[PDB]
Amino acid sequence: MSKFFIDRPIFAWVIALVIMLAGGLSILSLPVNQYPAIAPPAIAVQVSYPGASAETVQDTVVQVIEQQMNGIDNLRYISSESNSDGSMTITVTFEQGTDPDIAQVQVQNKLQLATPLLPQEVQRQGIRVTKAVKNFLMVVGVVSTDGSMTKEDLSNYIVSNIQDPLSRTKGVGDFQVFGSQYSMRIWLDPAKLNSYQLTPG
Amino acid sequence: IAQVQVQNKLQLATPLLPQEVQRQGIRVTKAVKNFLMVVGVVSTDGSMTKEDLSNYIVSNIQDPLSRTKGVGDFQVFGSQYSMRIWLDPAKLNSYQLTPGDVSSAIQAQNVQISSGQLGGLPAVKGQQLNATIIGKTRLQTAEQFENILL
Amino acid sequence: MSKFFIDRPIFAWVIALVIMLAGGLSILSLPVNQYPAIAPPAIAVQVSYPG
Amino acid sequence: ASAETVQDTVVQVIEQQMNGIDNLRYISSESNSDGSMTITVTFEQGTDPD
Amino acid sequence: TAKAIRQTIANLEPFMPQGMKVVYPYDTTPVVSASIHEVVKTLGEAILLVFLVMYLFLQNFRATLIPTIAVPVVLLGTFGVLAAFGFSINTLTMFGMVLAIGLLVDDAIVVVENVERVMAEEGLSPREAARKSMGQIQGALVGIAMVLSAVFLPMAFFGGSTGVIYRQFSITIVSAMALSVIVALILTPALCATMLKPIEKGDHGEHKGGFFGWFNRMFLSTTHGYERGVASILKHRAPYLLIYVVIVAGMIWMFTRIPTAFLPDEDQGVLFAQVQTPPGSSAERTQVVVDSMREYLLEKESSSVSSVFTVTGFNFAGRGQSSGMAFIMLKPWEERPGGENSVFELAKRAQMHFFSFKDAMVFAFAPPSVLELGNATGFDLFLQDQAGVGHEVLLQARNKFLMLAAQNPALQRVRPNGMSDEPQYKLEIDDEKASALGVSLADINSTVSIAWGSSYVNDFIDRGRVKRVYLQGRPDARMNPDDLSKWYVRNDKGEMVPFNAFATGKWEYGSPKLERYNGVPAMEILGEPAPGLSSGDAMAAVEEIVKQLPKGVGYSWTGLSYEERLSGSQAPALYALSLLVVFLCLAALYESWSIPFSVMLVVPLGVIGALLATSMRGLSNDVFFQVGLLTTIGLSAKNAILIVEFAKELHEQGKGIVEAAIEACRMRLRPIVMTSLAFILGVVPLAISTGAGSGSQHAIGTGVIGGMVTATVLAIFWVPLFYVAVSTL
Amino acid sequence: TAKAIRQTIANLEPFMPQGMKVVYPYDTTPVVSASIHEVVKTLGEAILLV
């Protein structure tokens, strides 16, 4: 029926009060940002390869891995490249409106068809599969003005202490630390190696 | 979604396989029952065998017809070009060589070289030149495989 | 119920018209095929061990 | 192996390669002397296990 | 997650030593925090003066709040249905609701007009007048919802890449209307019309207290001026449509004249500056310019920047020793006043300074409004090779395309992100004479890889952490090519032989950044059209240059131009189904054809002003303007329909066919002049605004007032003549 | 998907050499179009008698 609002005024109050309460409970549970997901998923895969040319890293470890990057749902295209310090990205983009977890695991199970096909040196470096989209959010980590600290121990304290409780929180997809961690560097001398009748091998 | 127990079943026996088996890859596909269509034919000009057409199919129209929508599997007839080597026992006995020596000579000569750069970091202070160095490149033709010191 | 629409014939027409326009949207915004998903899903593995 | 020889070379190299994953509560890794190793990780309440 | 990693990981600061600290050289929290804290303040300034303007209207100082208590409540229902649909709040739903908040008050205006029409000329109590109000407002209030929702309901169905931006200007806005009609049916006309409305025989308008007693007689004079103006315009009726058809001809001409854009940028307090050097240059040859530009930015432009943070070794245009990029953080929004502190003046001043640099191709640029796609604005062009032809011919094709690049009149400043051919050193070995000297080949490979490839042997433990141990020679014996002759290898019988006895090397050329695409190698350039021009003519001007290439290679489009090639602005498909659904739906009120067809013809009258308002401002078309046209033609339609149904229902009551229209304008002139200015007097701080998010606020501010200024003072002169047409039989 | 396959075949086949061709020896797609055409031909030839 109709016309049931004249007789009961506070029954017309409480229907506004209950939607006011329903709107008041929705603010504390809805997340706040400035822009929604506009870009398609952009599943990236990168490796490292020390001391090799761009032609070597093109004819060794991207030609054998782009032949298995197939059989994936909603594949748009494969933006891949290579550099001179032995770096490469094979970032595959997908269609709009797709959950990126299956886009991770399909690229993973198709990358399993290439890991024994890689040479032995690049397999001990570590394949990296990330769900990075396009951009960064924030950078931190700096030296104080007290001196006696270079960039190397700063990078080592960034990697060995800070990013290990940081990379497993919410929203973290990719890290791009400037500079590497500590390492044991052994530098040789060719004249001393010739004097002691030794190779480097 | 249902691939979850399939994607962990491989880890129990991936490196436990023999290495020559492991050098091919365990292809996990969503093939269900049947095909859709077939393509590929020779033209009226001839001058093609039953191998070069398959090599052209897998070299030119494998990935544009498999990176598209809906394609889950393909079972091509024939395959690509391959630098096949057919040893002979008579000349091997004449030169007193084992085929394992031939395979080790091939796997020692046809190697890509990760050389590096001339101006690599950390360089000396004041160095004003950097250039990558290209070492031994992979072979191209058949006579390049003929000119291999056994 | 009825009797609010014989006196309002264009209000009786507009429901059929918006149903026809929603149909004209859904005839182009729908995929067509021969048969639905009757087959069960199946996952396969393949190798090649020569010799 | 021993507890230290399984603590230095395997758990310490897998726990560095197990990041960038959604809804991680914590990773409680442990090891014993007889060659066992556990990287049991908990997720959020009400997620999907597979 | 920004506030959950900016201080919850800083809990290691007691565990941190005293020699280290934490700064923030790059950040994005103000453009997400201060934007929301500004839009809540502009919502307060929106519903801050709408009480006082209607208080000036109805002359009630105490019984005044009664149409404006529902208004701060019904906006919570928008957040409720937005949480029910599972879409996060953004700039989009705030920019929708800041214009939706003024259009949802119109039912509260029309119910207090229903109160005042029995309060002024009648001495009836509101308890007995509530039935008289609801007998005529229920047949007029439930019809506007289905014609107002049908401008976003077909707009919500469109998806794609430019469909998720159509959402949050879709049905999330008009859900507030769909609940406001429900609370208008159930909440206002039984209690707000009755209980806060005493009877004091209201016929005042002579003294009004203070500085208030000179408005009602002027309003009566304006109503009589409108009543004589409609009598003047019904005299001839031929030139008043002969000047209508010329502005219909002007609409399509202005629509053709104005160009379009796509998602204009803001300041954002950030700037990127990449560097470039000729190839072969070291890291010091790029370090010699970043300190110079750092000193320049820290001294000559100190009134604009807070801090700079450069890196080297990595860039957006590749990496290596020929690369490097710098982040630049400017002042906060209250610290950089004036238009000279914007990102565009700073960008052109930075480019004018970088013109003075000789050996460095430094380029500074600003990111767009959207951060999750694209580093800059423009388009790209992949160059595939179908036949698998070699690298030099496609490099020459890229060279010919970049030669025929600055000569195109539709494009400007198109550049590659790759590099030229780097001079590399190709080494060669004479393994025949090497085996004659008695050395192998695999030991030679092992020695050269350990000597220069910087090999990695195994792991080691340091401070409870697993780290790596490398192996390499020394730098001072490898910086020079003849220093590469300083190495020795062991032969079969223990002794050593030098490197130059068997191996030599020469100088060749090779690209440092090799890029593949869909299995084949492909290089690319990126650019943008002329300032103001669209991307369609820029796309058409480059598909004629692709006949000038070595034949065997082809082109491809990717990036944000991929969806532009697929489905960009669908303005042919748009504005058609949305017009047809309201053209079929508005006949549900009048139950005729000629009268809804005639009152549909007010929709050209409101769209014309928002076109030349952008030209008077100086901005181009955008998706924000593309929904601004929808909301202003919805406002014009709802401001036109609520006066013609009174004339139609009062023609059959006691009046004639030409007299009922001017009688309806004589009786219902108050709310149509009320709610239009009551809406647009809150949009002025959004219409003119400078600060955080000022560009996207200007992208909707200059259109909404221009679309309605041709709709509330102009279109009321044309709507009753459209009603009393001779074909309306 | 079948017409997408025929489009991504027909776009690049001018770049194939002239001593090559492509046919469809086995196909399941045209019987679907023939079936739906012959059953929409039994709609205009089915409602006129009613």
Short mmCIF file of N, CA, C and O in Angstrom, two decimals, chain E residues 479-518:
data_model
loop_
_atom_site.label_atom_id
_atom_site.label_comp_id
_atom_site.label_asym_id
_atom_site.label_seq_id
_atom_site.Cartn_x
_atom_site.Cartn_y
_atom_site.Cartn_z
N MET E 479 91.64 -1.21 -18.12
CA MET E 479 91.02 0.00 -18.64
C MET E 479 91.36 0.26 -20.10
O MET E 479 90.66 1.04 -20.76
N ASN E 480 92.41 -0.36 -20.61
CA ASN E 480 92.93 -0.11 -21.94
C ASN E 480 92.95 -1.40 -22.75
O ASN E 480 93.03 -2.49 -22.17
N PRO E 481 92.86 -1.32 -24.09
CA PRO E 481 92.88 -2.56 -24.88
C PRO E 481 94.22 -3.26 -24.87
O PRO E 481 94.27 -4.50 -24.77
N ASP E 482 95.33 -2.52 -24.96
CA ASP E 482 96.65 -3.13 -24.86
C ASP E 482 96.93 -3.66 -23.46
O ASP E 482 97.75 -4.58 -23.31
N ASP E 483 96.26 -3.12 -22.44
CA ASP E 483 96.32 -3.71 -21.11
C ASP E 483 95.67 -5.09 -21.09
O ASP E 483 96.02 -5.93 -20.25
N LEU E 484 94.74 -5.35 -22.01
CA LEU E 484 94.21 -6.70 -22.20
C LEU E 484 95.28 -7.66 -22.71
O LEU E 484 95.14 -8.88 -22.54
N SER E 485 96.35 -7.15 -23.33
CA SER E 485 97.50 -7.97 -23.66
C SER E 485 98.39 -8.28 -22.46
O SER E 485 99.35 -9.04 -22.61
N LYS E 486 98.09 -7.72 -21.29
CA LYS E 486 98.90 -7.95 -20.10
C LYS E 486 98.58 -9.27 -19.40
O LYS E 486 99.18 -9.55 -18.36
N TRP E 487 97.67 -10.07 -19.94
CA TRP E 487 97.27 -11.32 -19.32
C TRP E 487 98.00 -12.50 -19.94
O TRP E 487 98.41 -12.47 -21.10
N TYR E 488 98.17 -13.55 -19.14
CA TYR E 488 98.87 -14.76 -19.56
C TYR E 488 98.01 -15.97 -19.23
O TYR E 488 97.28 -15.98 -18.24
N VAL E 489 98.11 -17.00 -20.07
CA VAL E 489 97.40 -18.25 -19.84
C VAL E 489 98.39 -19.40 -19.85
O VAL E 489 99.41 -19.36 -20.55
N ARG E 490 98.10 -20.42 -19.06
CA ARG E 490 99.00 -21.56 -18.94
C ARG E 490 98.76 -22.55 -20.08
O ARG E 490 97.61 -22.90 -20.37
N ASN E 491 99.84 -22.99 -20.71
CA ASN E 491 99.74 -23.99 -21.76
C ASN E 491 99.75 -25.39 -21.14
O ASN E 491 99.56 -25.55 -19.93
N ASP E 492 99.96 -26.41 -21.97
CA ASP E 492 99.88 -27.79 -21.50
C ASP E 492 101.04 -28.18 -20.59
O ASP E 492 100.89 -29.11 -19.79
N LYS E 493 102.19 -27.52 -20.69
CA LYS E 493 103.38 -27.89 -19.93
C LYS E 493 103.78 -26.82 -18.92
O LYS E 493 104.96 -26.53 -18.74
N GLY E 494 102.80 -26.21 -18.26
CA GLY E 494 103.04 -25.41 -17.07
C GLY E 494 103.35 -23.95 -17.30
O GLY E 494 102.96 -23.11 -16.48
N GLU E 495 104.04 -23.61 -18.39
CA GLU E 495 104.44 -22.22 -18.58
C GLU E 495 103.27 -21.38 -19.08
O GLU E 495 102.18 -21.87 -19.36
N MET E 496 103.52 -20.07 -19.18
CA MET E 496 102.50 -19.11 -19.55
C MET E 496 102.83 -18.47 -20.90
O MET E 496 103.99 -18.29 -21.25
N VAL E 497 101.77 -18.15 -21.63
CA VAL E 497 101.89 -17.47 -22.92
C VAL E 497 101.03 -16.21 -22.87
O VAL E 497 99.98 -16.21 -22.21
N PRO E 498 101.45 -15.13 -23.52
CA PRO E 498 100.66 -13.89 -23.48
C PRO E 498 99.42 -13.98 -24.36
O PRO E 498 99.18 -14.96 -25.06
N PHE E 499 98.64 -12.90 -24.31
CA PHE E 499 97.34 -12.91 -24.96
C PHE E 499 97.42 -12.48 -26.42
O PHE E 499 96.62 -12.93 -27.24
N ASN E 500 98.38 -11.62 -26.76
CA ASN E 500 98.49 -11.08 -28.11
C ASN E 500 99.13 -12.05 -29.10
O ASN E 500 99.14 -11.75 -30.30
N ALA E 501 99.67 -13.17 -28.64
CA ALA E 501 100.33 -14.10 -29.54
C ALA E 501 99.35 -14.87 -30.42
O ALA E 501 99.75 -15.35 -31.49
N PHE E 502 98.09 -14.98 -30.00
CA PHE E 502 97.12 -15.76 -30.75
C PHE E 502 95.84 -14.97 -30.99
O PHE E 502 95.15 -15.19 -32.00
N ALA E 503 95.50 -14.07 -30.08
CA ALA E 503 94.22 -13.37 -30.09
C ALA E 503 94.43 -11.89 -30.40
O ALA E 503 95.36 -11.27 -29.89
N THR E 504 93.54 -11.34 -31.23
CA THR E 504 93.56 -9.91 -31.53
C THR E 504 92.15 -9.33 -31.40
O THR E 504 91.23 -10.03 -30.96
N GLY E 505 91.97 -8.08 -31.78
CA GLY E 505 90.66 -7.47 -31.71
C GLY E 505 90.56 -6.25 -32.59
O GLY E 505 91.56 -5.62 -32.94
N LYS E 506 89.32 -5.91 -32.94
CA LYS E 506 89.04 -4.76 -33.79
C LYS E 506 87.85 -4.00 -33.23
O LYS E 506 87.23 -4.41 -32.24
N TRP E 507 87.54 -2.87 -33.86
CA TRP E 507 86.50 -1.96 -33.41
C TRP E 507 85.30 -2.05 -34.34
O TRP E 507 85.41 -1.73 -35.53
N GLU E 508 84.16 -2.49 -33.81
CA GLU E 508 82.93 -2.54 -34.59
C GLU E 508 81.86 -1.71 -33.90
O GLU E 508 82.14 -1.04 -32.90
N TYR E 509 80.63 -1.75 -34.40
CA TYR E 509 79.55 -0.98 -33.81
C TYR E 509 78.38 -1.89 -33.47
O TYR E 509 78.13 -2.88 -34.16
N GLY E 510 77.68 -1.54 -32.39
CA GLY E 510 76.53 -2.31 -31.97
C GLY E 510 75.63 -1.56 -31.02
O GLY E 510 76.11 -0.78 -30.19
N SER E 511 74.32 -1.79 -31.12
CA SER E 511 73.37 -1.07 -30.29
C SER E 511 73.43 -1.59 -28.85
O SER E 511 73.51 -2.80 -28.62
N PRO E 512 73.41 -0.69 -27.86
CA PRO E 512 73.51 -1.14 -26.46
C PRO E 512 72.20 -1.63 -25.88
O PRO E 512 72.23 -2.39 -24.91
N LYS E 513 71.06 -1.22 -26.43
CA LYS E 513 69.75 -1.61 -25.93
C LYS E 513 68.99 -2.32 -27.05
O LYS E 513 68.45 -1.67 -27.94
N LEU E 514 68.97 -3.65 -26.99
CA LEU E 514 68.25 -4.46 -27.96
C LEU E 514 66.90 -4.86 -27.38
O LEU E 514 66.83 -5.40 -26.28
N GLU E 515 65.83 -4.57 -28.12
CA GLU E 515 64.47 -4.77 -27.64
C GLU E 515 63.72 -5.70 -28.58
O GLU E 515 63.76 -5.53 -29.80
N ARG E 516 63.05 -6.69 -28.01
CA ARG E 516 62.21 -7.61 -28.76
C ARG E 516 60.74 -7.34 -28.46
O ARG E 516 60.39 -6.76 -27.44
N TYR E 517 59.89 -7.78 -29.38
CA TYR E 517 58.45 -7.55 -29.24
C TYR E 517 57.72 -8.64 -30.00
O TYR E 517 57.87 -8.75 -31.22
N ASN E 518 56.93 -9.44 -29.26
CA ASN E 518 56.19 -10.59 -29.77
C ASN E 518 57.10 -11.59 -30.48
O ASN E 518 56.75 -12.14 -31.53
#
